[PDB]
Amino acid sequence: KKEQLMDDSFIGLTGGEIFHEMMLRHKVDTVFGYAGGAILPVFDAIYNSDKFKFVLPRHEQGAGHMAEGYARASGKPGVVLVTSGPGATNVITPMADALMDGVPLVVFSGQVPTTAIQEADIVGISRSCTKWNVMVKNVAELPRRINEAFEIATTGRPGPVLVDLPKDVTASILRESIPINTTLPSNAVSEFTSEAIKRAANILNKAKKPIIYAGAGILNNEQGPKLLKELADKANIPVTTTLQGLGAFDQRDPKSLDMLGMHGSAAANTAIQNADCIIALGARFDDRVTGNISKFAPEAKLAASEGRGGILHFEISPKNINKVVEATEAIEGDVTANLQSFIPLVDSIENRPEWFNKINEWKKKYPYSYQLETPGSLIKPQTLIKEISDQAQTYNKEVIVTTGVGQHQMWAAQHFTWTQPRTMITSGGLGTMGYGLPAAIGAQVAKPDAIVIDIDGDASFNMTLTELSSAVQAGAPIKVCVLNNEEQGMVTQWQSLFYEHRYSHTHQSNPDFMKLAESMNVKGIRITNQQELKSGVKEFLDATEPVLLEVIVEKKVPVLPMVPAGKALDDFILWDAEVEKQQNDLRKERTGGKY
Amino acid sequence: KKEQLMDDSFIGLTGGEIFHEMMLRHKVDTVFGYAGGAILPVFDAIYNSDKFKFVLPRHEQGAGHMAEGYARASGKPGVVLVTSGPGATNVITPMADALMDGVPLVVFSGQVPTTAIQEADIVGISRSCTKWNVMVKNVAELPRRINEAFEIATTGRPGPVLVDLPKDVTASILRESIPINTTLPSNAVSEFTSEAIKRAANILNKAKKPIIYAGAGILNNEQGPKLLKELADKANIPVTTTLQGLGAFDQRDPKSLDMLGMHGSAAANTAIQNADCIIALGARFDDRVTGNISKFAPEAKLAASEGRGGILHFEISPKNINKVVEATEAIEGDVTANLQSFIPLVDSIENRPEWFNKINEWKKKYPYSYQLETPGSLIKPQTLIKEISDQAQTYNKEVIVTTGVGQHQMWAAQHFTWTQPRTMITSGGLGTMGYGLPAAIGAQVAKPDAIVIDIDGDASFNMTLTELSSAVQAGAPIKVCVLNNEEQGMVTQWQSLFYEHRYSHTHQSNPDFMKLAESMNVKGIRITNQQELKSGVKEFLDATEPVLLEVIVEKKVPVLPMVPAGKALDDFILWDAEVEKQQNDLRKERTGGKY
Amino acid sequence: KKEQLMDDSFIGLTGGEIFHEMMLRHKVDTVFGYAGGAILPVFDAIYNSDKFKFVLPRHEQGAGHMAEGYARASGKPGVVLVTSGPGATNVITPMADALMDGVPLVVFSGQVPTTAIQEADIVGISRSCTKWNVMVKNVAELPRRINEAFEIATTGRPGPVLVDLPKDVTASILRESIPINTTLPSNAVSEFTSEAIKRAANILNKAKKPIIYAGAGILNNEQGPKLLKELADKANIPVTTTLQGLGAFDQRDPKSLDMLGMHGSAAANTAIQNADCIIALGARFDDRVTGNISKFAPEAKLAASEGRGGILHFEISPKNINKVVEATEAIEGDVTANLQSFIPLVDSIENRPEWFNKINEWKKKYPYSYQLETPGSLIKPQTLIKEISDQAQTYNKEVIVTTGVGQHQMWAAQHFTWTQPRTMITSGGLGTMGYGLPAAIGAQVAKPDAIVIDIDGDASFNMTLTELSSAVQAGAPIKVCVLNNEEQGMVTQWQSLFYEHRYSHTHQSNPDFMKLAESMNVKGIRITNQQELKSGVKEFLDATEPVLLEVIVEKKVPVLPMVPAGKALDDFILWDAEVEKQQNDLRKERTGGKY
Ligand SMILES: Cc1cc2nc3c(=O)[nH]c(=O)nc-3n(C[C@H](O)[C@H](O)[C@H](O)COP(=O)(O)OP(=O)(O)OC[C@H]3O[C@@H](n4cnc5c(N)ncnc54)[C@H](O)[C@@H]3O)c2cc1C
Ligand SMILES: Cc1cc2nc3c(=O)[nH]c(=O)nc-3n(C[C@H](O)[C@H](O)[C@H](O)COP(=O)(O)OP(=O)(O)OC[C@H]3O[C@@H](n4cnc5c(N)ncnc54)[C@H](O)[C@@H]3O)c2cc1C
Ligand SMILES: Cc1cc2nc3c(=O)[nH]c(=O)nc-3n(C[C@H](O)[C@H](O)[C@H](O)COP(=O)(O)OP(=O)(O)OC[C@H]3O[C@@H](n4cnc5c(N)ncnc54)[C@H](O)[C@@H]3O)c2cc1C
Ligand SMILES: Cc1ncc(C[n+]2csc(CCOP(=O)(O)OP(=O)(O)O)c2C)c(N)n1
Ligand SMILES: Cc1ncc(C[n+]2csc(CCOP(=O)(O)OP(=O)(O)O)c2C)c(N)n1
Ligand SMILES: Cc1ncc(C[n+]2csc(CCOP(=O)(O)OP(=O)(O)O)c2C)c(N)n1
Ligand SMILES: [K+]
Ligand SMILES: [K+]
Ligand SMILES: [K+]
Ligand SMILES: [Mg+2]
Ligand SMILES: [Mg+2]
Ligand SMILES: [Mg+2]
C-alpha cells in the first residue's frame, strides 16, 4: 500500500519539464517572463509549448504588472518567470504592488546553483514584499513547493509569492519517487462565526440609517456582486464602494452612492458619516477612504455605544480586523459565503423614507461638478473621461479600464459609469506610476474579446512606454489614452495648494507621442481641440489594432471633491467656479504668468 | 578651531580602559557580570577598580535579572557584562523581560574578533529583544556607541540595549583623535501637544464619574507620584493602578481603588467599567488589565461619542497610543511633565457625592475575601502576606518587594499595603519565573539601607535558587520567603478550572530548603503551623543576614477575584465559601483523594 | 480514488491529541518539558500517557540540555515541550548549543492564540538558533508541520527545530480531512560524487604518510566506527579524532593518535602537520582543531599542489565544504555510506615502516605529561580523571561521560580512555557551562543500564545545580563528580598567561556541596586528600542511587599541551616541571601569596 501513496511518473524529467507539467495541472494558460542564464532550463522546457501562451515584455517590471492585470481581469493567478539578479530585483515593485492590492501573483525567479549560495538575496529582499517566499533546494521537492506557492497566493487575502529556482535544481533530473499528494493541487463554519453572523443580523435589523461599504473583497467571488445586490435590495440599503471595488455594484442603480473617500463622492462621504450602521464587505478601511480616523463614522460609533448600530465587518484576513476601527461585529471568512448565511436572517424592509430622502438630497447637492469648457479653451480632462465612457458603452463588448497614477486616475474613477465587476484595474494600494500600459496588456490577454482602455497620464506613461512594442508582439489590441497636461498634475495640485504654487521639478518634457507610436508600430491619434473630441474618441474606440490616443487637456486643474489630510471625511473641499477663477490669477501672478 | 572639537585624552588607552572611563562618565556605580574569554580585556580593565562595585552571579540569567532589580529600584540603568556565545544567549530572557516591563538595561557582551565574524549571532538573536543593538567595529567608535546605548536605553519608554564588543576591539589601543561630543554623555512642547492638553482638560471638567488609571510610567519621574496625588486631590478623582504601578499612589488614601485587572480589586474593575472619563497615566492597557477589550470601558466609550467624556491617554511611546483602545485625547511625552501643564487647567472640584457613594459601596462589597484558617488547618497564603506586610511596616527602613510568578505574585500584589514608589519589583510583562531572588539581590545593591523581601513560589525559587550564594558573596542581606504549596499553583488553578482537575506534570519535588539554605551559608527559618506564623515572620524580618524563610501554605487555593479570558472586566469570579468547599470535594473525588 | 489519498482518522481529535498521536508515530518515548498556560492543551493530552516518559526539570534550559544528552546518547531526536514567553526564551541557549554540535533537537513551544499575534517573537528570536522554525496556524496542518520538523532535524547535519503551537490551534478540534501523506512520517548516488570517490581513492593510494581525521559525523551512523576501523586497517592509516569524535576509534589500538587540536595530543598535532594525505571523516575543521589556518596541514597542501596527496573531505553539509580549508576532493553525503564505496577502491597496504616509525617516536615523545602529586599536596586533577577512568572500565556496564566547560572538560578528554561511540557527550561548539548535569540526566534516561558520569567544574556545576532534584524525581542514578578547584580554572589559565596573574572576578564562592547534595536527597561523597582518592572513587562508582562526589583538586594548574591562538598546530606549549615551578613563584609574588 506504500506504493499507492507515492508517484513515479515524474522520474526521468528535469526540473523544467516538471515545472511545465505542474503549470498544466494548475490550469496555467499564460506566462509573463524574460529570459536569462539561471532560468534557461525552465525556458528550454516551455520551448514551443503549445499548452500555454508566453508573453515577452521589454522589462521585467513590465512582466510583473502584466501578470497583475491578467490576475485582476481573469481571477486566475498571474505567473511571472524571470531570471536571477537584476531580473529578480526588477519585479520587486510589481510584487509590492500586488501585495497592497491583494493580487494573486506567482513569481518564479531563476537562481545561481545551490553550490554558489548576477547574485542577489532575492528571498531576503522579497520577504517584505510577499505573503511567502521559498527556495527549492532539490528537484524532488519542486512539485511540492509549486503547489504551496499557488495555494498561498490564492487563498485568504490573495497576494504575491516568490519561488526561487536554482539553475542546478531545474537542470537536474528527478530519480526519487515523490509523495503523490505533492503532484496534485488541492484537491464548515465555526460556531463562533455562525453566532457572530446572527448577532450581526440583529444589529442591522435595528438600523434606520444603514449603508453598505463594499470593496475589492466582494470581487474575489463570482457570486459576490450578485449577493451584494440581493442584500441591498432586501434590506433596502444604499451602496458605496472603494476605488478597488468599482463595478461591484451597478452605479446606475438608485441606491448607488458612487465612490467614497479622499476624492470620492461628497454624497457618499456625508452618508457614511451620518450612517448608524456600516456594513463593510471586503474593504480594509484604507486611510485614503476614512480620512481622519478618529472623526470617522461618528453616528456609527455612537450607535454602537447605544447598542442600536455599529460597524459590521466581513473580513477574510484577521490581520485586517480591528486594525483601523473597532468592529462592532467581525464576521471572518469569505464575504460572499458569509453573505449566504447573513442575508436570510435580515428583515426584508421595503421603504426608508426619511433616510433615502436625506441621501437623494445629498446626491443632488454633491455631483462631480467641474469647470466646463469655454470657447477656445482646452478640453477639460473630466469631459474627456465622460466622452470615452459614453461611447464605449455603445459597443457590444465588455470594457476593461486600467489607469496610471495621478489626477487622470481619480477623474477616471469619478466620471466613468461602472456596471460590471473586474473592470477597474488600477494601482490603489502602492500607487505605481507606469502601471497602466502593461496592466492593460495583461488584461487584454486574459480577456481577448474585451475592449481594454488605458486612461494614462503623460508622466505615468513615460515610465513604461517601451512596453508598447510588447503589446504589438503579443497581439494585444489595447487602447491607450494619454491625458497630456504636460505636467505631473497630482503633485502640482499639492504644490498649488500647500506650497504657494512653487512647482519644484514637476514638469517633465514629453516626447512626440505620435512619432513614438509610429516607431512602436502602433496607431496614433491626437486630439488638440474641442471639435475633434467626439470624432477622435470614436476613431480611438473603433480601432481593431493597438492604438495610442493623445489628448491635449487643460493644465493646473484640481481634482475635486478633496478631503485634505487630517480633516474629517465630511469636511471636504467642493468645486466652486469663483474659487477656481481666483486660483488661476494667484497662480499667474506668483509664477509670473508661466503656469 | 578644528582642534577644539576633537579630544585626544583617550589616545593610548585600550578598549577596556576606555570602557572603564565611559562607565565613570555615565555615573555607573554597579556592574553585574560573568567572566569569559572574549570579554577578558574589559575585565582586565575593571580589575580592582575602586570606582564601582562588581557583582558576580552563578549564571548570566542571574546577572540580567539582578541588573533589572537594580534598575527598577534605583532608576539608574542596570549594566550587564557577559562574554560571548553561551554567556550572551543566557541574557536573552532578562533582556526580553526588560523590554516588556520598560527596564533600562545596558548589556555589553564580549565577542570573537572582527577577523572571525563560542560564536553566535548575538546581534541577530537579540534584535527582537532590544530597543537597539550594535557591534562596535573599532576602538575609536567605542565611546560613541556607549553614549548611544545609554541614551536609547533611558529615553522614551526605557528598555534593554545590547552592545557587542569584539575581543580585538577592546584589546586594541586608540591612536586616532575622536570627536569631543562622543566622549561626553548628553549633556520645548509642541503646539500640537499643548492644545491637546487643554482640549483634554475641558473633557475632564465635564466628567461626573472620573477615574485615574495609573501605571509604571508615572514612576519614571520622581515628581510623578507627587503630581498624581495633586491631580487626584484637586479634581477629586479615585485612583487605580496596575501591577507595575503599585506604590505610585498611597493605598491608605480613601481615593485609592487598589489594583485593577484580571486579579485586581473587583471594586476597581467595576469603577473603571462605569467611569465616564478615564485618565491613563503611564499605562499601556495590557490585556491582563482590560479583560475583553471590546467590552472594556463601556461608559467611557459612550461618553466619548456624546462629547462628555472618554479616555485621556498620557503616553511617551507613540507605538502604544491607539494600539489597544482609541484614545479620545492623546497627550504625548513624559506624563509627569505634561501633568505640570494639565493640572492648572483642571477645575478644582470639592465633592462628588453620587459618584464616591457608588465607589465606597463597591469598596465595601468587594474586598479581597478568602477562606480563613480553621483549627488545625495549614496557614492560608493570603494570611502570610498580610502578616509580612503588617510587620514590615513597623520598621524604620523602607521596604522593597520582589516576587516570582504565580499565585504568590498576585496574593502579594493584593494583600500588601503599597505606599511608596518603586517598591513593587516584579516580572509582569514577560512573567519570568526565577525572577524574584536575583531581582531582590540587585535591588538590595541599589538600596543597601532597605529591607528587600522576595515573596517567591517554590517552583519559581527552584529555577534560580543557586543565586543564594551570589547574595552572600555580594553582601546583600535579602529576605527570601518561599510560599511552599508543593505545587505550581497558578497552572493548577487553570487545570482545576478548565481541565477537570487533571494536574498534568504540575507538581515538582522540592528540596529541603533548610538544608539548602545551610549549604548556601544562609539563615534558615521554617514555619509549619499557624502558631509559628507571627514569631516566625518576626525572626525573618529581624535578621541582619541573608535569610531563607519557608512557609508551609494551603494547597489548591484559587486566586480571587478572577476575570476569566474572554469575559468582561466587571464579569468576574468572586470568592464564595460554599463554592470553595464544593470545589474541595470535587477535587478529592476526581483525583481519588490525592490532591 | 480521491478518498484513498485523504485520511479522516484524526477528525474529532484536538491539537494536543493529534500531537500525542504524531509523537507515537515518530517513535518518541521521552519528552522533556515544563508546564505553562499556552501549552496546557498539549499537556492535558499527554496526561497520564503510558505511551512515553515525561521528564520534568526545574528550569527550561535544563529541559533543553537534557534533551541534547538524550539525543546524543541514543541517536534519537530529543523532544522539548515548553510554554510561551519565558519558557520559550529559556531554551535559546540549548538550541544554540544543539546547532553548533549538530544535535537533533525538536522544540515545541506553546504560544498565545492566533488572535493575539507572556508574548514573544520566539520564531524571530530562534531563527538564528535553528535549522528551521515554524508556527502552526491551524490544527489541520499540525501533523504536516510535525513531520517536517522531525525530518529537517534529523537529516543532513542534524540540528534544532522550533515548532510554535498557538493555544487555540492545540485546543481546536480537527474537522477537515487531511492528506494521508501528512499523517505518516517518511516513509541513489550522483555520478558527480561516485567519480569523486574514485578520484579520491587514487589520491590515497599514492600517499606514503596518510592520516585519518575523524569527527562527530562518523557517529551519526551505526556502521561508522566499524567502517572507520576497516579503512584504517586495510590501508594501514593512523587515526586522530576531535573532541566530539572521541569513542569513534578504539584508543587502545596502536594506530590511535588520540585527540588533536588546541589541547589535543602533541603527537596528533605533529602527525597531521606532516601528513601528505588527510582523510576528513565527518569533521568541520573547527578553529580549535586547526590552530592557525594558514599554517595548517603544510605537507598536505604541498602534496596537493604536486598531485601526490591533499585533503579528502567527507561532508554531508555543503556549507561546511571549502569553508575553512580547500578540499582536494569533496565527497558529499553520509560519510559511512560513502565509505562503503570508497574502501573497496583503496589498495590494501600492510606496512608503512618509515611513517609509523616517526609516529611511534612522536607518541613516545608527546604523552599527556603533568606534575604528579607530592607528599602532602592536593590531588592533581589529571590523576582524578585517570582514577575514574580505570575504575569505571572494571564494570560490566557501558560508561557514558558528560562534562561541563573548562579545564576539567579538557582533562577528561585527555586522560579518559575512549573505546565506544557516543560515550563523550560534551558542549564543544558553543561551550555551555552548566551543560554537564542536565545532559547526564538525559543520557541516563536514554541509556538506563549505563553508568553516566558527569565530570563537572565547580563554576559550571553552580550554574545548573538545581537540576539535582530533577535527577531524583526522574529516577536517574547519575554520577556527578565536581572538580572543586575553587576557581574558574580555564579563565584563570588565560589570566595567568596573558594578563600577568590579574585574576579579575574569576573566583566564585562555592556552597557546601555535601549539604547541597543532602538537601537534594542525593548521596554525597567528599574526597579531600590523596589517601581517600581510590576508596572514594570506588564508593562513587559503586553507588546505585544518584551521587554527588566532591574532590578537592590542585588550583592554578594549566591544561597542557596548549596551542595558543594564532600559533601553528605544531607550535605548542609542552609541560615542563621547571617551568611550572617557576610559574608558581611568579604567581605567589605578584598576587602577594594569595593564589
Ligand atoms: C492617488 C490615490 C488616491 C486614492 N484615493 C482613494 C479614494 O478617494 N477612495 C477610495 O476608495 N480609494 C482611494 N485610493 C485607493 C486606496 O488607497 C486603496 O487602494 C483602496 O481604497 C482600497 O480598496 P479596498 O479596501 O476595497 O481593497 P483592498 O485594499 O484590496 O482590501 C480588500 C479587503 O477585503 C479583504 N478581502 C479580500 N478578499 C476577501 C474575501 N474573499 N472575503 C472577505 N474579505 C476579503 C482583504 O483582506 C482586504 O482587507 C487612492 C489611491 C491613490 C493612489
Ligand atoms: C500571572 C500574571 C497576572 C497578571 N495580572 C495583572 C492584573 O490583574 N492587573 C494588572 O494591572 N497587571 C497584571 N499583570 C501584569 C500585566 O501583564 C502588565 O505587566 C502590567 O499590567 C502593565 O503595567 P503598566 O502598563 O502600568 O506598565 P508598563 O507595561 O511598563 O507600561 C507603561 C506604559 O507607560 C509608558 N511610559 C513609560 N514611561 C513613561 C513616561 N515617562 N511618561 C509617559 N508614559 C510613559 C510606557 O510606554 C508604557 O506604554 C499580570 C502579570 C502576570 C505575570
Ligand atoms: C574550551 C574548549 C576547548 C576545545 N578544544 C578542542 C581541541 O583541542 N580539539 C578538538 O578536537 N576540539 C576542541 N573543542 C571543541 C571544538 O570547538 C568543536 O566542538 C569540535 O572540535 C568539533 O568536532 P567535530 O567537527 O568532529 O564535530 P562537529 O562540530 O559536530 O562537526 C561534524 C561535521 O561532520 C558533518 N557531518 C555530520 N553528520 C554527517 C554524516 N552523517 N556524514 C558526513 N558528515 C557529517 C557535519 O556537517 C559537520 O560539519 C574545544 C571546545 C571547548 C569549549
Ligand atoms: C513611481 C512613482 N513615482 C512617483 C509617484 C508620485 N506621484 C503620484 S501621482 C504623480 C504625478 C503623475 O503625473 P501624471 O502621470 O501625468 O498624472 P496626472 O496627475 O498628470 O494626471 C506622481 C509623481 C508615484 N505615485 N509613483
Ligand atoms: C519560565 C517560566 N515557565 C513557566 C511559566 C508558566 N507559569 C506561570 S505561573 C507558574 C507556576 C509557578 O509556581 P510557583 O512558583 O510555585 O507559584 P505558585 O503559583 O505556586 O504560587 C508557571 C509554571 C512561567 N511564567 N515562566
Ligand atoms: C555560560 C558560560 N559563561 C562563561 C563561559 C566562559 N568560561 C569558559 S570555561 C570557564 C570557567 C569554568 O570554571 P569551571 O566550571 O570550574 O571549570 P574549571 O576550569 O575550573 O575546570 C568560563 C567562565 C562559558 N564557556 N559559558
Ligand atoms: K461614477
Ligand atoms: K493592597
Ligand atoms: K585518551
Ligand atoms: Mg500629467
Ligand atoms: Mg507553588
Ligand atoms: Mg573550577
What span, in angstroms and rounded, lies between the C-alpha atoms of B365 and B431? 30
Is the CB–ligand 3 distance for residue C282 below 6 Å?
yes
| DSSP secondary structure of B310-356 | EEEEEES-GGGTTSSS--SEEEES-HHHHHHHHGGGS------HHHH
B398 phi, psi to nearest 5 deg: -85, 145
Are A342 and A325 members of one domain?
yes
Q: Is A298 on the interface with B (CB under 8 A)?
A: yes
* C263 has binding-site annotation: yes
Check if the beta carbon of residue B514 is closer than 8 Å to that of residue B526: yes
Q: Is C526 on the interface with B (CB under 8 A)?
A: no
Amino acid of residue C529: N
Q: Which long-range contacts (CB under 8 A, 24 or more apart) does B585-593 make?
A: B586/B501, B587/B496, B587/B501, B587/B556, B590/B500, B590/B501, B591/B501, B591/B503
**Helix, strand or coil for residue C594?**
coil
Nearest to C271 by CA among C234, C244, C297, C242: C297
Q: Which three cell numbers mark C217?
A: 559525523
Is the CB–ligand 2 distance for residue B314 below 6 Å?
yes
**Which ligand sits nearest to residue B456's alpha carbon?**
5
* C286 has binding-site annotation: yes
Nearest to C57 by CA among C35, C39, C41, C28: C35
Provide the residue range defining the domain that includes C180.
1-186
HSE-up (13 A, CA, CB side) for residue C203: 29
HSE-up (13 A, CA, CB side) for residue A257: 30
What span, in angstroms and rounded, lies between the C-alpha atoms of C527 and C537? 8
Check if the beta carbon of residue A279 is closer than 8 Å to that of residue A211: yes
Provide the edge-to-edge strand list for the sheet that holds C399-403: C424-425, C399-403, C451-457, C479-484, C547-552, C523-527
What span, in angstroms and rounded, lies between the C-alpha atoms of A148 and A150? 6
Check if the beta carbon of residue B10 is closer than 8 Å to that of residue B142: no
| DSSP secondary structure of A498-554 | HSTT---S--PPPP-HHHHHHHTT-EEEEE-SGGGHHHHHHHHHH-SS-EEEEEEB-
What span, in angstroms and rounded, lies between the C-alpha atoms of B536 and B547? 12
Provide the chain B residues 104-133 that lie in CB contact (below 8 A) with chain C.
Answer: 116, 118-121, 124-125, 127-129
Residue of C32, C34, C59, C466 to mutate, ligand 5, most atoms within 8 A of C-beta: C34
Are C82 and C145 members of one domain?
yes
What span, in angstroms and rounded, lies between the C-alpha atoms of C468 and C441? 9
Are A154 and A196 members of one domain?
no
Check if the beta carbon of residue B218 is closer than 8 Å to that of residue B281: yes
Question: Which one-letter DSSP state was computed for residue B476?
Answer: -
Q: Which three cell numbers mark C187?
A: 516513509
Resolution of the structure in the document, Å: 3.0
What span, in angstroms and rounded, lies between the C-alpha atoms of C21 and C13? 10
Å from C70 to nearest chain A CA? 30
Question: Which residue blocks in A343-488 are alpha helix, DSSP H?
Answer: 353-365, 381-392, 407-415, 436-446, 458-464, 468-474
Q: Grid coordinates 540540555 are at which residue?
A: C65
Against chain A, the chains showing at least 3 CB pairs within 8 Å are: B, C
Q: Is B565 on the interface with C (CB under 8 A)?
A: no
Nearest to C525 by CA among C504, C502, C541, C510: C541
Number of domains in chain C: 3
Question: Which one-letter DSSP state was computed for residue B177?
Answer: P
Cα dihedral B289→B294→B295→B298 (10° resolution): 100
Provide the edge-to-edge strand list for the sheet that holds B310-315: B256-259, B239-241, B210-214, B277-281, B310-315, B329-332
Q: What is the CATH number of the domain that holds C279?
A: 3.40.50.1220
Å from C472 to nearest chain A CA? 44
Nearest to C494 by CA among B35, B63, B173: B35
Query: How big is the CA angle at B365 (ends B362 and B370), to the nearest 5 degrees?
Result: 130
Nearest to A275 by CA among A249, A239, A225: A239
Q: Is B324 on the interface with C (CB under 8 A)?
A: no
What span, in angstroms and rounded, lies between the C-alpha atoms of A154 and A177? 28
HSE-up (13 A, CA, CB side) for residue B70: 29
Q: Which residues of A touch B321 (CB under 8 A)?
A: none
User: How crowded is residue B283: how many other Cβ atoms within 10 Å of its Cβ?
Assistant: 25
Q: How far is CA C281 from each of CA A167, C236, C334, C343, rounded to the nearest angstrom?
A: 30, 16, 10, 13
Q: Grid coordinates 562508582 are at which residue?
A: C541
Question: Given the CA of residue B462, which atom of ligand 5 is nearest to it?
Answer: 15
Nearest to B174 by CA among B13, B8, B7, B5: B13
Check if the beta carbon of residue B35 is closer than 8 Å to that of residue B83: yes
Radius of gyration of chain A (CA): 25
**Alpha carbon distance, N-terminus to C-terminus of chain B:** 80
What span, in angstroms and rounded, lies between the C-alpha atoms of C62 and C82? 11
A240 phi, psi to nearest 5 deg: -115, 150
Question: Given the CA of residue B317, which atom of ligand 2 is nearest to it?
Answer: 47
Check if the beta carbon of residue B16 is closer than 8 Å to that of residue B171: yes
Burial class (CB in 10 A: 0-12, 13-18, 19+), B203: buried
Cα A156 vs. chain centroid, distance in angstroms? 17
Check if the beta carbon of residue C291 is closer than 8 Å to that of residue C230: no
What span, in angstroms and rounded, lies between the C-alpha atoms of C208 and C391? 39
Minimal Cα distance from C129: which residue of B? B125
**Beta-carbon separation of B326 and A294 below 8 A:** yes
Q: Is C364 on the interface with A (CB under 8 A)?
A: no
Cα dihedral C195→C201→C206→C211 (10° resolution): 130
* C315 has binding-site annotation: yes
What span, in angstroms and rounded, lies between the C-alpha atoms of C6 and C176? 10
What span, in angstroms and rounded, lies between the C-alpha atoms of A241 and A289? 10
Is the CB–ligand 5 distance for residue C36 below 6 Å?
yes
**Alpha carbon distance, N-terminus to C-terminus of chain A:** 80
Q: What is the CATH number of the domain that holds A574?
A: 3.40.50.970
Nearest to A170 by CA among A21, A17, A312, A51: A17
Which residues on neighbouring strands pair with residue B80, listed in sequence order? B32, B107
Are C44 and C18 members of one domain?
yes
Which residues on neighbouring strands pair with residue C108, listed in sequence order? C81, C163
Check if the beta carbon of residue C488 is closer than 8 Å to that of residue C406: yes
Cα dihedral C101→C105→C111→C113 (10° resolution): 130
User: How crowded is residue C75: how many other Cβ atoms within 10 Å of its Cβ?
Assistant: 17
Minimal Cα distance from C39: which residue of B? B491
As a residue count, chain A comes to 595
For A125, the enclosing helix (H) or strand (E) is helix A122-125
Q: Which three cell numbers mark A589?
A: 501672478
Q: Which three cell numbers mark A530?
A: 474641442
Are C388 and C259 members of one domain?
no
Q: Which residues of B touch C515 (CB under 8 A)?
A: 515, 518-519
* Those residues with Cβ within 8 angstroms of residue B504's Cβ, 6 or more apart along the chain or in another chain: B495, C35, C40, C43, C44, C46, C47, C48
Question: Given the CA of residue A334, which atom of ligand 1 is nearest to it?
Answer: 42
For C552, the enclosing helix (H) or strand (E) is strand C547-552
For B151, the enclosing helix (H) or strand (E) is helix B142-154
Query: How big is the CA angle at B121 (ends B115 and B126), to the nearest 5 degrees?
Result: 135
- Distance (Å) from CA B328 to ligand 1 centroid: 27
* Those residues with Cβ within 8 angstroms of residue A581's Cβ, 6 or more apart along the chain or in another chain: none
Interrupted after residues, chain B (C–N over 2.5 Å): 117, 187
Q: SS3 helix, strand, coil % of chain A, rounded to 5?
A: 40, 15, 40
Are B581 and B468 members of one domain?
yes
**Which residue owns the Cα nearest ligand 4 atom 5?**
A433
Strands A78-82 and A105-111: parallel
Burial class (CB in 10 A: 0-12, 13-18, 19+), B119: middle
Check if the beta carbon of residue A98 is closer than 8 Å to that of residue A61: no
Are C216 and C259 members of one domain?
yes
Amino acid of residue A269: N
C105 phi, psi to nearest 5 deg: -110, 125
Query: How big is the CA angle at B145 (ends B140 and B147), to the nearest 5 degrees?
Result: 115
Q: Packing angle between helix A381-392 and helix A407-415, nearest 10 degrees?
A: 50
Are C395 and C249 members of one domain?
no
**Which residue owns the Cα nearest ligand 1 atom 15?**
A428
Nearest to A550 by CA among A419, A455, A463, A452: A455
For C240, the enclosing helix (H) or strand (E) is strand C239-241
Q: Which long-range contacts (CB under 8 A, 24 or more apart) does B1-7 make?
A: B4/B180, B5/B179, B5/B180, B5/B181, B6/B177, B6/B178, B6/B179, B6/B180, B7/B177, B7/B178, B7/B179, B7/B180, B7/B183
What span, in angstroms and rounded, lies between the C-alpha atoms of C457 and C508? 12
| DSSP secondary structure of C287-322 | HHHHSSSTTS-HHHHHHHHTTS-EEEEEES-GGGTT
What span, in angstroms and rounded, lies between the C-alpha atoms of A99 and A578? 43
Nearest to A296 by CA among A595, A519, A567: A567
What span, in angstroms and rounded, lies between the C-alpha atoms of C75 and C446? 9
Nearest to B55 by CA among B435, B471, B519: B471
Are C357 and C493 members of one domain?
no
Question: Which residue blocks in C109-166 are alpha helix, DSSP H?
Answer: 122-125, 142-154
Q: Which three cell numbers mark C97?
A: 548549543
Q: Is B579 on the interface with A (CB under 8 A)?
A: no
| DSSP secondary structure of C457-516 | EHHHHHHHGGGHHHHHHHT---EEEEEE-SS-HHHHHHHHHHSTT---S--PPPP-HHHH
Q: Is A306 on the interface with B (CB under 8 A)?
A: yes
3-state SS track over C354-417: HHHHHHHHHHHHCCCCCCCCCCCCCECHHHHHHHHHHHHCCCCCCEEEEECCCHHHHHHHHHCC
Amino acid of residue B286: D
Question: Which one-letter DSSP state was computed for residue A278?
Answer: E
Interface mutation vs chain C, best among A1, A5, A184, most C CBs within 10 Å: A5
Burial class (CB in 10 A: 0-12, 13-18, 19+), B115: exposed
Against chain B, the chains showing at least 3 CB pairs within 8 Å are: A, C
What span, in angstroms and rounded, lies between the C-alpha atoms of B100 and B119? 27
Å from C104 to nearest chain A CA? 21
Strands A178-179 and A6-7: antiparallel
* Those residues with Cβ within 8 angstroms of residue B187's Cβ, 6 or more apart along the chain or in another chain: none
What span, in angstroms and rounded, lies between the C-alpha atoms of A421 and A248? 5
Q: How far is CA B557 from each of CA B31, B492, C34, C288, rounded to the nearest angstrom?
A: 40, 9, 21, 55
Domain stop point among C137, C162, C186: C186
Cα C89 vs. chain centroid, distance in angstroms? 22
Domain stop point among B186, B203, B232: B186
HSE-up (13 A, CA, CB side) for residue A248: 32
Strands C6-7 and C178-179: antiparallel
For A303, the enclosing helix (H) or strand (E) is helix A298-305
For B542, the enclosing helix (H) or strand (E) is helix B533-542
Q: Which three cell numbers mark A575?
A: 468645486
Are B351 and B433 members of one domain?
no
Check if the beta carbon of residue A40 is closer than 8 Å to that of residue A89: no
Cα dihedral B509→B512→B517→B518 (10° resolution): -150
Q: How far is CA C444 from each of CA B382, C107, C221, C402, rounded to the nearest angstrom?
A: 41, 20, 21, 10
3-state SS track over B344-402: HHCCCCCCCHHHHHHHHHHHHHCCCCCCCCCCCCCECHHHHHHHHHHHHCCCCCCEEEE
Q: Which residues of B touch A195 (CB under 8 A)?
A: none
What span, in angstroms and rounded, lies between the C-alpha atoms of B441 and B475? 9
Check if the beta carbon of residue A157 is closer than 8 Å to that of residue A429: no
Q: How far is CA A315 from each of CA A157, A204, A242, C15, C508, rounded to the nearest angstrom?
A: 9, 17, 15, 25, 59
Domain stop point among C342, C367, C392: C367
Q: Which three cell numbers mark B419?
A: 505606599
HSE-up (13 A, CA, CB side) for residue C51: 15
Nearest to C425 by CA among C414, C412, C406, C440: C440
Are A159 and A226 members of one domain?
no
What span, in angstroms and rounded, lies between the C-alpha atoms of A8 and A175? 9
Burial class (CB in 10 A: 0-12, 13-18, 19+), A566: exposed
Are A558 and A568 members of one domain?
yes
Question: Given the CA of residue B408, which atom of ligand 5 is nearest to it?
Answer: 21
* Those residues with Cβ within 8 angstroms of residue B228's Cβ, 6 or more apart along the chain or in another chain: B212, B214, B218, B239, B248, B249, B281, B339
Check if the beta carbon of residue C74 is closer than 8 Å to that of residue C101: no
Check if the beta carbon of residue A106 is closer than 8 Å to that of residue A165: no
Q: Packing angle between helix B60-74 and helix B92-101, nearest 10 degrees?
A: 20
